């Protein structure tokens with residue numbers, strides 16, 4: 001897992017989010033099934049909810065609010081990449097400026113699956 | 115020898131070639147110089 | 159348009175290199191590697207492990223000359239890497255990462271030669287694209303005709319290949335291991351009869367200079383023997399580097415005659431004229447009269463004075479009398495292959511045929527057999 005560790009007096013939110021997904025009650029311990037549920041939801045195949053698609057195109061975009069076709073083309077067939085480029089719009093950042101290559105998955109997912 | 119210390123690869127280069135005034139080897143030396151001279155620790 | 163490609167001809171004797179789209183190569187230099195053999199006593203002169211190319215020719219007195227390419231095959235790959243590095247950096251002064259390279263090699267060669275050449279030109283020099291071509295096809299480009307049989311004789315190997323209307327017949331390609339180095343060795347052997355003895359590798363270049371300067375192909379062999387026996391008008395005088403004067407005489411037209419009669423060397427194979435005729439007869443019936451009219455000579459070994467008349471007369475004797483035989487020898491036939499390379503390297507339709515770096519990465523060095531030829 002891409003988790004930087006032991007920064008000099010700094011707090012990161014990835015480990016906190018993982019701990020909340022595993023043990024939301026802050027029990028301090030994870031059982032065999034508590035980690036197995038995370039492993040099963042992280043491993044493969046079937047999907048329960050669209051929220052994992054929501055925050056997994058964020059991880060595919062490496063935390064960026066916009067994604068590119070080149071980033072999508074190391075994981076996905078160019079058939080589906082052409083589909084995505086045809087049906088998903090251009091990204092607008094919080095500053096308001098528009099990249100020519102900026103693509104928003106948030107609006108697309110909330111439009112089709114919401 | 116200082117250039118060889120920096121592991122810059124020179125071929126068919128000699129001191130007597132530079133002293134004698136050979137054109138091609140001098141130009142090659144200049145060309146080669148131009149190309150080649152411009153805790154978390156505990157967790158891992 | 160964008161960046162121009164590099165054209166490199168690696169014959170067995172001499173290496174030639176230049177930019178694509180140019181008329182003549184920029185760098186022409188012998189393919190030798192020299193290393194010293196005596197003791198070194200002067201402290202502070204600096205060291206030099208190897209002498210590459212022309213630099214080894216001037217200081218050849220204190221070196222043992224070694225040839226990396228033998229009979230068209232690369233035997234010592236390290237010296238080939240040294241020669242290629244010297245060509246790229248000292249002779250042309252170009253970074254190899256920006257340019258594609260086009261290379262030349264013989265018709266019939268071992269597979270490992272091409273595989274190792276592709277691996278070397280991709281792995282170390284990091285060229286973006288590369289290609290391998292047959293030398294005689296490039297000669298047919300240099301001539302500018304679509305149909306003909308082309309015979310190329312270098313320092314390593316002689317080969318004949320016929321091409322009709324852009325299609326090359328693979329079963330009619332003939333390869334013969336009789337070239338300029340064998341003629342140089344035969345000249346070294348027959349110069350013993352007059353009393354001159356050359357043994358070390360330094361004197362081989364002197365014998366080669368003698369052969370290039372004072373040798374010619376006799377039109378009629380026995381008549382020239384009679385003439386040289388009758389008079390002394392055929393003798394010529396040459397001056398050695400140390401100042402002695404030698405006089406060849408009879409051996410001027412006996413060294414290049416050995417191409418037409420390989421039994422002088424002990425070889426069982428036929429002459430070059432019979433090889434060309436047999437390679438013509440291996441083809442089909444309908445294209446033979448076109449091949450008779452478009453015979454092309456290529457390579458440096460065919461630069462003897464009087465080679466064209468002897469070849470035309472021999473092939474006229476062997477062929478049926480009802481057809482005409484013409485031999486097309488351009489005056490600049492030494493560099494013909496390289497010129498053809500330039501004509502190939504900057505065609506618009508050729509740009510889709512380079513071996514891409516990604517293709518090599520995903521295919522290994524075995525991609526060169528699927529492409530090229």
Ligand SMILES: Nc1ncnc2c1ncn2[C@@H]1O[C@H](COP(=O)(O)OP(=O)(O)O)[C@@H](O)[C@H]1O
Nearest residue numbers: 169170171172312313338370457458459461462
């Ligand atoms: N002017 C010449 N006359 C006769 N023979 C020559 C001449 N120039 C070169 N040669 C012969 O051709 C050889 C060089 O041929 P070259 O074209 O360099 O072969 P390759 O390029 O295929 O190695 C020399 O070894 C020499 O024997």
